[PDB]
Every structure is written in structure tokens, then in C-alpha cells.
Design a protein around this ligand. Structure first.
Ligand SMILES: *CC(=O)Nc1cccc(C)c1
Lengths: 235, 179
């Protein structure tokens, strides 16, 4: 994470992130719609931070500090670079859409009127196919990754030392190897919950209600295809 | 401090997400009740034992039968949730949640939790249920279901008022420590 985005998403909601006089200028439905959008971006930020912990802290740490076969590290952290590139581009697009919506002279007061188009482009076409193929692979390799980590911790003492060091900071409390792997699997099932609650407060602009409805169906078609392509691997 | 894993299972609007958020925050969200729960690691001291309790949620996974089982590995305690204002959610406990939880998690303590107990004396909740020829889930019905499915225990709570929330998670920690 970068301090700019950590501070921008430090607040518990959009109502507490924007200035109090700025909040007082808007309708209740606007405050509710923006609170759910802010959360979609907040959790997307946390999702990319999780994927960076897996790539730079755990994965890269095991390559430089340990004498493990590169095929073993690939089994512990499958498709993490592809997932990192996929969601980093999405977070990028969500963060730019927030900066375009920013009030001139302010760095925290914003109202996003268009989100649907951003989601339709992410959850459709070749971008969605890349993501569907990536998550079907990740989730089919998820068990073998948990089992491989557990075998390495119950045979190698230098791997045990490495895990105690990297995860020692309080920052990594809920973010160990196995927690990160499950964090990445549960992520795709969060989107229809977020987009449905966003859609619920987007009945002002009609093109926007249709965009969020089109994206909602796109996320469900995608989830159904990731679920259909899962086929658990064994050691 | 021993690490133990908790997973909450149950139907869609049974309140499993609300419950986790209220426990992890300690209060009912004042300004914004979040939509989702990522994960949380709780420091609990039950009966003089210090435990690290990883809290997970299955909300969003209810329709994906090949994704959902990926939440179950290494579970030490299952909170089996149902809503007191929805007697239909209780009917699905022995038909859908119990066969699946017992298949992926053999020998894992299950605590049947009855969420939304405040709605048992709510006016609008009783009128709507009367149209469907029903009434809120009675304590004896929950106990009779926890007994029939072989649950470790039956507990009720309210995420809204926070009554009984601390006790469900403390009991879950005691249940996870059994071996
Ligand atoms: C652009 C902007 O920041 N406008 C604004 C309106 C009301 C109150 C405050 C502090 C700013």
C-alpha cells in the first residue's frame, strides 16, 4: 500500500472520509450510495495489499532467503502475479474514477456518479475471460497450496523460522500464508454483494441503474463459470 | 497463544455477517454497517486460556457449491446460523447445512446459533410471519433442532442490541479447544 491511498481509505465509511460540511450538502440516498462505493474500493485496496504481501513478502522472501525448489514456491503461491496484475489494474481504474470525482481544492471530498461502466468493462470480454481462467486455476490449486505449506512447516525448521519472522509485525495479524490464500478465494464472492447494495441506491440516473444491473449479471455469470471450472488437485 | 479457526455457515439473510462485524468491532456499527466481512483474528481469554481465533464467513458462497468447501479446511469450530424471524432457514439446517458441514468437517463442534432474537417481540416481524401462517422460532424449537442434528450446543443472540454475542464467541473458543 501507499500512504496516500491508506489515508484516503482510513475512515470507516464515506460519511467520515469526506468533510462534515461537504457531507451536509447532499441527499441521504447519495450518502448511502457513496458509502457502498467507498467500501468496494476500500476492500479492493485491501485485496491488492493482500496479493502484494503474497508476492513480495512471502513468495520473494522464500526465493532469496530459502533453498526451496522454484516449483515448490509456485505451488504455495499459484497465479499470484497474474492476480496481482488483474486487480492492480482494477484498483488503478477505481482510484482514478475517485480522483476525477474530487472537488477542486480538496483531496477527500468526492461523489462518484458513474461506476457501472467501470464494472461492465472489468467483468466482460477478454478481461473477464482472463480473470475466470485465473480464478478457476487458483481455486483448483488452493487445497494443494494449503497442504504443501503445512508439509514444509512440519519438516523444515528453516521454513518455520522464515514464517515466524515475516508474520511477526502486528500488521500481518490476519494475513499469514493460509489466511492470504483463503482471502483471495473469498474475494470474488464479495462483488455481487457490493454491486447489489450499490444498485439498490442508484435509481436516480436510469443509465446507471441499467449499468449496475448489467454488471451484476456479469459478475454472477463469471462466478458461475469459475465454480463450474473448479477441479481440486492433490499432492 | 494457540491458534484456532472459526467458520460461520447458514442461509443468506440469516445475519452471519452482522454478527461477525459486531463482535470484531465490539459495538453495533454506528454510522455504516458494512456489506462484507473479509476476516479477523480475535484475542480471546476463555476460562484462563489465551487463544487467537480466526473468524471466517461464508456469505456470498451460498450458491457456489464448488467454491464454498474451500472455506472449511482446518476448521476447529462451526457456528451454524439461522434467523429467529425466518422459520424456513431452520428447516434447511438438517437438510442442507448439516450434511455438508459433517462431510467436509467430521468431528468439528457445531454450535447452533439463533440470530435476531430481538425480532421475537417485534410487531412488524410477527404480522408479516402471520400472513405466511407462521411465528418467530421458539426457544424449544431451536433446542430441539440442535439436539436432532447433534450440535455441541444451542445459543441465541442479537447482533442489533449485542445481547449474547460475546458469549457465543467465548463458547465457540471453548468448543474449539476440545480434543
Ligand atoms: C470542492 C469542495 O471541497 N467543496 C466543499 C463544499 C462544502 C464544504 C467544504 C469544506 C468543501
Amino acid at each position: 500500500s501507499m500512504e496516500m491511498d491508506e489515508k484516503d481509505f482510513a475512515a470507516d465509511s464515506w460519511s467520515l472520509a469526506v468533510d462534515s460540511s461537504f457531507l451536509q450538502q447532499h441527499k441521504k440516498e447519495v450518502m448511502k450510495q457513496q458509502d457502498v462505493i467507498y467500501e468496494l474500493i476500500q476492500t479492493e485496496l485491501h485485496h491488492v495489499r493482500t496479493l502484494k504481501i503474497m508476492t513480495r513478502l512471502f513468495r520473494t522472501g522464500m526465493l532469496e532467503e530459502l533453498h526451496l525448489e522454484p516449483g515448490v514456491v509456485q505451488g504455495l503461491f499459484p497465479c499470484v502475479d497474474e492476480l496481482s496484475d488483474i486487480h492492480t489494474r482494477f484498483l488503478s481504474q477505481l482510484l482514478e474514477r475517485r480522483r476525477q470525482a474530487l472537488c477542486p481544492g480538496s483531496t477527500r471530498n468526492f461523489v462518484i456518479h458513474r461506476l457501472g461502466d467501470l464494472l461492465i468493462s472489468q467483468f466482460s470480454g477478454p478481461s473477464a475471460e482472463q480473470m475466470c481462467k485465473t480464478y478457476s486455476e487458483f481455486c483448483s490449486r488452493h487445497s494443494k497450496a494449503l497442504k504443501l505449506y503445512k508439509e514444509l512447516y512440519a519438516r523444515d525448521k528453516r521454513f518455520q523460522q522464515f514464517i515466524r519472522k515475516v508474520t511477526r509485525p502486528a500488521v500481518l495479524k490476519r494475513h499469514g500464508v493460509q489466511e492470504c490464500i483463503l482471502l483471495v478465494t473469498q474475494r470474488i464472492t464479495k462483488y455481487p454483494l457490493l454491486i447489489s447494495r450499490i444498485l439498490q441506491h442508484s435509481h436516480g440516473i436510469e443509465e446507471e441503474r441499467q449499468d449496475l444491473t448489467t454488471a451484476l449479471g456479469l459478475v454472477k455469470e463469471l462466478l458461475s463459470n469459475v465454480d463450474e471450472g473448479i477441479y481440486q488437485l492433490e499432492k | 497463544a494457540i491458534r484456532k479457526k472459526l467458520v460461520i455457515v447458514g442461509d443468506g439473510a440469516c445475519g452471519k455477517t452482522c454478527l461477525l462485524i459486531v463482535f470484531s468491532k465490539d459495538q453495533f456499527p454506528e454510522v455504516y454497517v458494512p456489506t462484507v466481512f473479509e476476516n479477523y483474528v480475535a484475542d480471546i481469554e476463555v476460562d484462563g486460556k489465551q487463544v487467537e481465533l480466526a473468524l471466517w464467513d461464508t456469505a456470498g458462497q451460498e450458491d457456489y457449491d464448488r467454491l464454498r468447501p474451500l472455506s472449511y479446511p482446518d476448521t476447529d469450530v462451526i457456528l451454524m446460523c439461522f434467523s429467529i424471524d425466518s422459520p424456513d432457514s431452520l428447516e434447511n439446517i438438517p437438510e442442507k447445512w448439516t450434511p455438508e458441514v459433517k462431510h467436509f468437517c467430521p468431528n468439528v463442534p457445531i454450535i447452533l446459533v439463533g440470530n435476531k432474537k430481538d425480532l421475537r417481540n417485534d410487531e412488524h416481524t410477527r404480522r408479516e410471519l402471520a400472513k405466511m401462517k407462521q411465528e418467530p422460532v421458539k426457544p424449544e424449537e431451536g433446542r430441539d433442532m440442535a439436539n436432532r442434528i447433534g450440535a455441541f450446543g444451542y445459543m441465541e443472540c442479537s447482533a442489533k442490541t449485542k445481547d449474547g454475542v460475546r458469549e457465543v464467541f467465548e463458547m465457540a473458543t471453548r468448543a474449539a479447544l476440545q480434543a
